[PDB]
Amino acid sequence: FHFKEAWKHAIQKAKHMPDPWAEFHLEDIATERATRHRYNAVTGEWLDDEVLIKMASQPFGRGAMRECFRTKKLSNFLHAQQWKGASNYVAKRYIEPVDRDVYFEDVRLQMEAKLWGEEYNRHKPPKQVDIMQMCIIELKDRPGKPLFHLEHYIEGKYIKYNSNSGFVRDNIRLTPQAFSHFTFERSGHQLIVVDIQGVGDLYTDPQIHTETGTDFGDGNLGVRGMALFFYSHACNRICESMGLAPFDLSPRERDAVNQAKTILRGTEEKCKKIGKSILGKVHLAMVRYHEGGRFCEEEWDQESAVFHLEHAANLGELEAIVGLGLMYSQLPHHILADVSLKETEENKTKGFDYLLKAAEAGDRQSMILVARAFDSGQNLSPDRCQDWLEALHWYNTALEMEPRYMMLAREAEMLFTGGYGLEKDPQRSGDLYTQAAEAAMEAMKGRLANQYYQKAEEAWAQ
Amino acid sequence: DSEEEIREAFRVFDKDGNGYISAAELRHVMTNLGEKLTDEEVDEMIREADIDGDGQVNYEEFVQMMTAK
Ligand SMILES: Nc1ncnc2c1ncn2[C@@H]1O[C@H](COP(=O)(O)OP(=O)(O)O)[C@@H](O)[C@H]1O
Ligand SMILES: CCn1c(=O)c2cc(C(N)=O)c(N)nc2n(C2CC2)c1=O
Ligand SMILES: [Ca+2]
Ligand SMILES: [Ca+2]
Ligand SMILES: [Zn+2]
Numbered sequence: 001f002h003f004k005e006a007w008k009h010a011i012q013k014a015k016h017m018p019d020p021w022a023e024f025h026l027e028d029i030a031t032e033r034a035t036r037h038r039y040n041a042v043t044g045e046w047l048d049d050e051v052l053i054k055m056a057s058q059p060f061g062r063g064a065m066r067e068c069f070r071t072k073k074l075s076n077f078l079h080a081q082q083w084k085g086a087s088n089y090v091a092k093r094y095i096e097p098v099d100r101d102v103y104f105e106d107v108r109l110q111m112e113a114k115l116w117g118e119e120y121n122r123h124k125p126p127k128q129v130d131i132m133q134m135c136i137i138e139l140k141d142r143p144g145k146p147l148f149h150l151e152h153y154i155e156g157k158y159i160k161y162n163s164n165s166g167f168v169r170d171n172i173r174l175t176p177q178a179f180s181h182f183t184f185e186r187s188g189h190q191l192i193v194v195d196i197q198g199v200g201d202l203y204t205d206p207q208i209h210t211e212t213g214t215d216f217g218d219g220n221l222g223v224r225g226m227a228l229f230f231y232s233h234a235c236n237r238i239c240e241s242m243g244l245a246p247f248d249l250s251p252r253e254r255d256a257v258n259q260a261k262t263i264l265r266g267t268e269e270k271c272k273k274i275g276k277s278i279l280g281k282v283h284l285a286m287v288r289y290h291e292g293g294r295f296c297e298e299e300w301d302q303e304s305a306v307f308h309l310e311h312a313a314n315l316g317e318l319e320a321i322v323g324l325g326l327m328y329s330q331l332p333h334h335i336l337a338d339v340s341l342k343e344t345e346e347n348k349t350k351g352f353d354y355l356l357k358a359a360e361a362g363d364r365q366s367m368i369l370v371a372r373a374f375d376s377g378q379n380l381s382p383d384r385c386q387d388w389l390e391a392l393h394w395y396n397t398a399l400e401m402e403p404r405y406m407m408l409a410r411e412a413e414m415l416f417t418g419g420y421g422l423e424k425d426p427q428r429s430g431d432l433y434t435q436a437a438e439a440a441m442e443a444m445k446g447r448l449a450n451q452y453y454q455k456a457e458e459a460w461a462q
Numbered sequence: 463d464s465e466e467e468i469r470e471a472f473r474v475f476d477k478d479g480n481g482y483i484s485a486a487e488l489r490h491v492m493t494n495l496g497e498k499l500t501d502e503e504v505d506e507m508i509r510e511a512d513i514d515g516d517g518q519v520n521y522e523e524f525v526q527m528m529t530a531k
Contacts, residue, residue: 001510001511001527001530002510003503003506003507003510004527004528004530006497006499006503006507007471007507007527007528009497010474010475010491010492010495010497011471011474013495013496013497014474014491014495017495075473075479077469077473077479078466078469078470078473079466079469080466085470087473087479114480117486118484118517121484121485121486121517122517127486127489127501128484128485128486128489128505129486130478130484130485130486130487132477132478133478133479133480151478152477152478152479154477154490155494156490156494199490200486200489200490200493201486201489201490202477202478202486202487202490
């Protein structure tokens with residue numbers, strides 16, 4: 001105990017420090033009874049107890065969704081605390097009414113983010129962090145039995161270092177941004193803790209984006225929320241001290257991002273197919289945001305969007321593989337619709353290869369396009385050849401997955417005559433014409449069905 | 463009286479009231495209290511009392527630090 005005196009000197013200073021909220025005379029407010037609900041994130045269990053509170057009638061601060069009230073509360077850890085010594089607390093409530101469960105899920109959010117702060121601290125960072133415990137008080141005597149969040153008051157300059165929508169703070173501090181990036185890496189890209197705000201490195205009201213995007217309330221923007229973070233994230237020495245992999249940004253994006261007191265200590269420690277798959281979805285989310293104007297600065301950056309569409313396709317995102325296959329094939333496309341790529345023989349090989357990959361991954365649209373390429377040569381790469389057996393393999397795969405009777409009748413046509421490596425099979429041609437006739441009846445194309453039945457008899461008459 | 467006194471002392475440093483004094487909380491309290499200590503002395507104050515090695519100081523570890531003649 002070479003610091004026991006340092007503890008005492010601080011304890012004595014505190015006994016002589018004045019209450020920063022003395023001027024507000026919260027002790028004069030009529031006392032109110034409340035049930036407090038405190039959460040344990042490791043066990044998932046709740047502990048309830050009865051408390052006495054004195055809450056100001058008017059909020060001293062607010063945001064877009066929540067307002068804060070100055071509050072005093074007696075401790076149930078102390079045995080005989082008088083109101084003259086009550087600690088200072090901040091009570092928070094949603095400005096517009098929300099469902100009661102929101103208050104409980106917000107506590108789960110904050111306490112889960114508190115666990116991630118403890119994980120970050122276990123990697124020996126230059127500056128440690130802590131997320132303030134938040135609980136729920138229930139004012140059962142008030143009209144409607146309203147719920148409030150409650151936490152201890154942290155005196156000092158309240159600063160929002162980042163948001164849940166891409167904002168970054170201008171005397172830039174390294175620790176808040178490194179913590180957020182750490183949670184992305186350490187969780188295997190399954191979550192990120194953002195909206196880092198508070199006093200110093202004591203944080204409150206954080207937000208978690210998850211891969212599913214189903215928990216932690218409406219602030220969970222999913223992989224879109226991770227994209228907003230990494231669009232403006234400049235990795236710092238803490239990010240690299242812990243071996244956090246940088247996000248692959250475009251040349252224009254990296255320069256705009258590249259367009260500090262916290263120093264390393266040499267003790268920082270270092271922090272899967274699922275993550276690379278989530279990483280692909282984060283890249284695809286950047287594409288949609290570029291197209292949607294979220295990254296406005298001139299005109300929407302088409303080159304950076306394509307940069308992220310290729311990274312998404314290379315990471316396995318089927319929507320990106322289909323999109324690039326159509327774009328390199330000079331075909332209409334949904335993603336980056338107004339963007340066109342230069343027609344070149346190299347790209348026409350890439351276009352078909354992407355469409356073939358997408359076909360082999362289950363995309364019905366690519367399977368019909370690949371079938372037609374092997375059938376008629378349309379959109380077929382010049383490295384390949386018309387192959388009617390291969391075309392059969394992709395028509396029927398689409399049928400077993402536009403009109404089905406059209407593809408069934410086409411298969412029968414090819415088998416009635418043969419060609420391009422496919423040997424004729426009249427019996428199968430009549431069978432497929434029969435399936436097409438039945439498919440035409442289910443589509444109310446009765447006259448077309450009679451034609452298919454007649455073509456079936458002719459194929460069998462051979 | 464000294465028991466409550468120690469309990470009140472623990473609440474001075476357990477800034478969020480979760481039962482554990484963290485290094486970040488101790489840094490905030492020492493800075494707010496005007497006490498002049500480097501960011502390393504704060505981490506050492508935690509490590510000296512951290513018997514279970516979880517990086518934080520619970521009440522019992524705090525008691526053992528204060529009631530250790
Ligand atoms: N989430 C929790 N679940 C259970 N017990 C808790 C929890 N957080 C703190 N405690 C216990 O309660 C004590 C603090 O009680 P109290 O002073 O009534 O809280 P506050 O400081 O929030 O007013 C802590 O020292 C610890 O023993
Ligand atoms: C709704 C988010 N939020 C807080 O959570 C918050 C917490 C504390 C605290 N625990 O001390 C504080 N002092 N200030 C806060 N503010 C600022 C308006 C004043 C906030 O916006
Ligand atoms: Ca604490
Ligand atoms: Ca400990
Ligand atoms: Zn980083």
